[PDB]
Amino acid sequence: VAYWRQAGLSYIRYSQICAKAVRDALKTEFKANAMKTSGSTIKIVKV
Amino acid sequence: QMSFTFASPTQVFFNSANVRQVDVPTQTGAFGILAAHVPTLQVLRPGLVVVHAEDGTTSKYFVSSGSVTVNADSSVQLLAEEAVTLDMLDLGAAKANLEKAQSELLGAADEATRAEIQIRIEANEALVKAL
Amino acid sequence: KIRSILHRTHSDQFLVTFKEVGRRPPTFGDASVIALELLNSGYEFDEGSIIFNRFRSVISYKTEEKPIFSLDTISSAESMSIYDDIDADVLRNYQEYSLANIIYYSLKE
Amino acid sequence: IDTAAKFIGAGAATVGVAGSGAGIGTVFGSLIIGYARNPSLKQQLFSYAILGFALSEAMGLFCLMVAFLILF
Amino acid sequence: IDTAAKFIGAGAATVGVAGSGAGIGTVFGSLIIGYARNPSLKQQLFSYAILGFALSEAMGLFCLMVAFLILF
Amino acid sequence: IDTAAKFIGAGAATVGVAGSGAGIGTVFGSLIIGYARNPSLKQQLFSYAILGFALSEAMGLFCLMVAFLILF
Amino acid sequence: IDTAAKFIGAGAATVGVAGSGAGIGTVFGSLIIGYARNPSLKQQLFSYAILGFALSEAMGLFCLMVAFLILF
Amino acid sequence: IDTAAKFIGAGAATVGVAGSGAGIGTVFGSLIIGYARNPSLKQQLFSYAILGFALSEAMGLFCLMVAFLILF
Amino acid sequence: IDTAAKFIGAGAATVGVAGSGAGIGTVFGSLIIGYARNPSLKQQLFSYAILGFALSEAMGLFCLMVAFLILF
Amino acid sequence: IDTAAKFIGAGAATVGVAGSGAGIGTVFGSLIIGYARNPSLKQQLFSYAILGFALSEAMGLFCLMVAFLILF
Amino acid sequence: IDTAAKFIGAGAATVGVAGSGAGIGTVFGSLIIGYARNPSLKQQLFSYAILGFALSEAMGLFCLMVAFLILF
Amino acid sequence: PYVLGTGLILYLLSKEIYVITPETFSAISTIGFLVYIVKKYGASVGEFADKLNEQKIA
Amino acid sequence: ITPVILGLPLVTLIVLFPSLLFPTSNRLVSNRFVTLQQWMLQLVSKQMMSIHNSKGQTWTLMLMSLILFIGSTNLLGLLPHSFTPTTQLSMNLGMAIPLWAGAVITGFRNKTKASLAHFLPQGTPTPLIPMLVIIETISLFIQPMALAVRLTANITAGHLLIHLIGGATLALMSISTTTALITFTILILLTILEFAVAMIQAYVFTLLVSLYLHDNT
């Protein structure tokens, strides 16, 4: 946590920016799949 | 002589595989974990995963992040966030992203954003590393 | 549907609740997202259990439960400490990381 | 007394180079135990190692100029 | 006697500058391993390293003044 | 002998300032490698560094008064 | 000779205060890098800081006792 | 000469207590870093710190024996 | 000249023990901090601290034999 | 006086090799714990160890150049 | 003077073994903390500790050659 | 504050009366004192808030 | 007679006013005066109490009087000179008995043969080896009590040198100033680096040692 609790970020956030950045990166066919596998697809809907 | 569990959500790359070492861009510093390794969790940097499999292999990866979980016994569990073979990572993007990154940083006002940006930079950069 | 039976007997003891779990199937990301939210909600540090339907076979799962480990107060002290040679930070930032992993898993389970 | 004490007076000022001798081993040794944590070897760390080795041979540039003053 | 042991008194005073030389490496070498943990270079650690280089070379200045005292 | 060996006795007493100079480098180095772990800059770690450089040059003021006794 | 050597012998035992002044720089350094690991600052570590600076200043107070005995 | 050089030799042997003083700080400092890593403070690690202060004061008692032999 | 210089020869030869005492504090400290990381204490590592405290005292018996040679 | 002070003054410059020998144990020791965290053995780490010991024994070869210039 | 300065000069050259003495404790100390990080003990790590005790006793053998040159 | 300033002044005079007291000794110390004052007056104001308010509250 | 006789009452009297004033402040007045002076013991009861208890309420206030006295006594050797080379040295020797007696009160008075039975039974001294207990009784008492006199005398020495070296530099280069001003400007700044640091750490030493006794007693 240099900023993963010290400028916010969690390991979750930090990491998630990483993966996200990996998704940001990566080649596109894979990036399609991004949003699938491990691409956050939470629907934050209380019920 | 380590049961290397190398997995990502998407993949298990090595699963309790008799790897001799994994050289670890654990947030730590360069460390080449062989075999059993002390219960410690050390969290992983974006880096490369080099899987010195007990056999000369080093399997290549770039890793986004994640955690290494070093379970006392023979087992290592690299739970790498996005740890991808460099194959599927995109050099063109690494620089481009890095420029772009540099653009972003400036707007990555607020360390939490920055953190992400510097991260991105770091990432893109880190992509520039090997790519 | 968790909260659709335990919606029907609690509601603001939830913080948020998630759909798209069904009606197209979950992802890790999502697990990380929820992993994230769990934290800021200070219910974190009052411990939980994570209850999911642990699959066994098509027909069956055994609703399983674990107790939360995303608390750094588990990452604190205990005999837990003695299994360490690393500080309760990168441990704690695993409490984080693992929350997603498991949550994903369970979620999927 | 005058020429005799100028010989056992630049020899005791030559043992001042023991601070620069082990100080260069402590500075460059920390850089070898630093780039092992990786990866900012090129610049940042090894560039700072040239700032630490100069500030350790600075005492070596003031102790060897002392013994060379009692010589000629 | 008066001119003799003043020459062998400045030489042993120059051996007190062996602490500053090995002190300079152990203070600018711990900062060479501090930025290896990163990223306070030109912020906190490198700023305190100058405040660590001054506290050690002053014990070299207070020793070179004794060596200059027994020379003029 | 009397007005001679006290001038070469203040030179040997100034060699005790190799511990107050190399003790400051060890002190103001671990408070630079320790602040790299962060974030106890003020009030804790650097405050203890004032009490670390207080028992470091205390052996040096006791070594600067031993040489001052062999001069004045 | 009989009056000369006591002055040259008092300074030579004052060079044994270079080991106590750096041994206090290592004990207080490894407590400054021993408090960054956290959290028992009071007691345990800094309570044994005076217990580690007592056996290391014990070599200085015995050495400055052999330096004062050749002076009085 | 014979009643003179015994005072300019017993003092130089007290400079051998520089390793006993800086050895006590290093053996205790790493004990303060070893007990900062936890948890066997009561025996095992701090018990071995007594077995490290003894094998470090032995090279300080043998050096103080030679200084006492040239004085009495 | 003959009776005197042998007393000021075993005195400066006792300043070679200043490494055998501090180096033993370095090895027994690294075994004190090494056993903290665990678990090979009653084998492997503390059996290497005996092989380290001997090689350090190996220049502490070679130096001590020279101080025993100039005396008797 | 012109030949006598050339034999006891070439001995005080042999204490300047105390820094090249203790510094070599710091330039190789910080390379032992460096390759322990691994993995760049050949190249990078051990290559930086050679450029460090050369800058550690340089204060030993120049100190043996001021030693042999007092006896030959 | 001819038999005097070679008898007090052979004693000052024995202060060069204080470097190899503590320099041997560090190279065998970092091998105790290195094999604590495990596990390449036989070969690689403990095979380098011989390469680190040889380059440190090389200045010791260079210093023990000087003290034996004024003794025989 | 004024009483303390008077008390210090008296002590400085007692010093100067003391048998040996050269310009150089005195100039160092008086400058050494002088440096503190300007910081001290700003410190005395900043100090002020806590304790008498903390007393009043408790 | 007079010079030494005038000195000790003065050191007493400066400590006396604060110690009378705080007892007074507990209901009147306060005007400007009482509240201003009240801040003195408020800083004592603020700063020092962050370490105390620790050893318990009982022994606390007894020690804090001496800790304040030592720091205040050094402050009354700061500004006065000539003073340091003679008068402060006689005061360091006059404070010597109190520092030696401080270990006696609880340690040596109840157990002379083994005062470490009150101070530290298991720690620095080995309880398995009664020989080392008696050896380290010097390193933990006999010697540290002599060091506590040298501890105030080390401040005396560094403060004295500033002023002697000053004196000698302006006497050597009586130019008005001129080149001596460069050196003298440094010698000034040394008073803060030396005395103001070392004086604080001096009464920290008395704090810690007198804690380690009464905390294990």
Author numbering:
A (entry chain I): 1 to 47
B (entry chain H): 15 to 145
C (entry chain G): 111 to 219
D (entry chain N), E (entry chain M), F (entry chain L), G (entry chain K), H (entry chain J), I (entry chain Q), ...: 2 to 73
L (entry chain T): 1 to 58
M (entry chain W): 10 to 226
From the paper:
3D classification of the images resulted in seven distinct maps of the enzyme, each showing the complex in a different conformation. Initial 3D classification produced three classes, each of which appear to show a ∼120° rotation of the central rotor within the F1 region of the complex (blue arrows), similar to what was seen previously with the S. cerevisiae V-ATPase. Further classification of these three rotational states was able to separate state 1 into two sub-states, subsequently referred to as states 1a and 1b. The state 1a to 1b transition reveals a bending of the peripheral stalk towards the top of the F1 region near the OSCP and F6 subunits. While MDFF with maps in this resolution range cannot be used to determine the locations or conformations of amino acid side chains, loops, or random-coil segments of models, it can show the positioning of α-helices in the structures. Figures 3A and B compare the fitting for state 1a and state 1b, illustrating the accuracy with which α-helical segments could be resolved in the maps of different sub-states. Fitting of all available atomic models into the density map is shown for state 1a (A) and state 1b (B). The largest change between the sub-states of each state can be approximated by rotations of the α3β3 hexamer relative to the rest of the complex by angles ranging from 10 to 16°. All of the sub-state to sub-state transitions include a slight rotation of the c8-ring against the a subunit. The different sub-states do not appear to have a specific sequence or represent specific intermediates in the catalytic rotation sequence. Instead, the differences in conformation between sub-states when taken together illustrate the flexibility of the enzyme, a property that has been linked to its rapid rate of enzymatic activity.
In the mitochondria of eukaryotes, adenosine triphosphate (ATP) is produced by the ATP synthase, a ∼600 kDa membrane protein complex composed of a soluble catalytic F1 region and a membrane-inserted FO region. In the mammalian enzyme, the subunit composition is α3β3γδε for the F1 region with subunits a, e, f, g, A6L, DAPIT, a 6.8 kDa proteolipid, two membrane-inserted α-helices of subunit b, and the c8-ring forming the FO region. In addition to the rotor, the F1 and FO regions are linked by a peripheral stalk composed of subunits OSCP, d, F6, and the hydrophilic portion of subunit b. The proton motive force, established by the electron transport chain during cellular respiration, drives protons across the FO region through the interface between the a subunit and the c8-ring, inducing rotation of the rotor.
